[PDB]
């Protein structure tokens, strides 16, 4: 299935200015920023999807990710496969690794307390990760096997929740300012 999710949320921090241009296709150029989400994909996640994109400019001028990035219910979740970033590697609990589409990544989970999440701007929610344990080149066409994740997650302890909301190919950003330009299908 192509896209059928625009994914534009900024805290109001700064600017962030996104396009959501044809097909699978978006871009971000932001400045001085809090955080934001930007980024296509699809209403409904799936552990069984493979997403592919192509990141014909990731510039991120301070932290930025370049990340899978998606939510479940029962339980509340967010959890990411972060490809590359800018001046930041997020890390958290080391879980384990997983490798993936030519790449090795670590596994880490997080708490978020009073936060802003798809449910309210002050709730408590779980993170999970996997983080590329390199950037990953970009420019070409990319894959992310995400069941390989969800795999090696679950062989962690790591569950997701049984009601999928949604899932994009990102752009994440925090304290920043940056232009990224990525199509996903
Ligand atoms: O940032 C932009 C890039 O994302 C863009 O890259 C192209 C993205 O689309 C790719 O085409 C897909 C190939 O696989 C098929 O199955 C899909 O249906 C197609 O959408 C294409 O190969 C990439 O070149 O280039 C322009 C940049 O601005
Ligand atoms: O459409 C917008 C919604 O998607 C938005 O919902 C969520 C708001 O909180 C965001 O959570 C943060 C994501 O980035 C992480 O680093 C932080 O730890 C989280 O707190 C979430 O991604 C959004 O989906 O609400 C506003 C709507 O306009
Ligand atoms: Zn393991």
Known sequence: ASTDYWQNWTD????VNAVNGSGGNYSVNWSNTGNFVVGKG???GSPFRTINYNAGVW???????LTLAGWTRSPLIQYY???SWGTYRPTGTYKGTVKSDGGTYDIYTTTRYNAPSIDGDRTTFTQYWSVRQSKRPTGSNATITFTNHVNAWKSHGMNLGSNWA???MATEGYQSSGSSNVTVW
């Open 42 to 44: 699809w209403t409904t």
């Open 166 to 168: 949604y899932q994009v």
């Open 81 to 83: 496969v972060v490809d």
């Open 12 to 15: 109001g921090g700064g600017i």
């Open 59 to 65: 510039a991120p001028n301070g932290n930025g990710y």
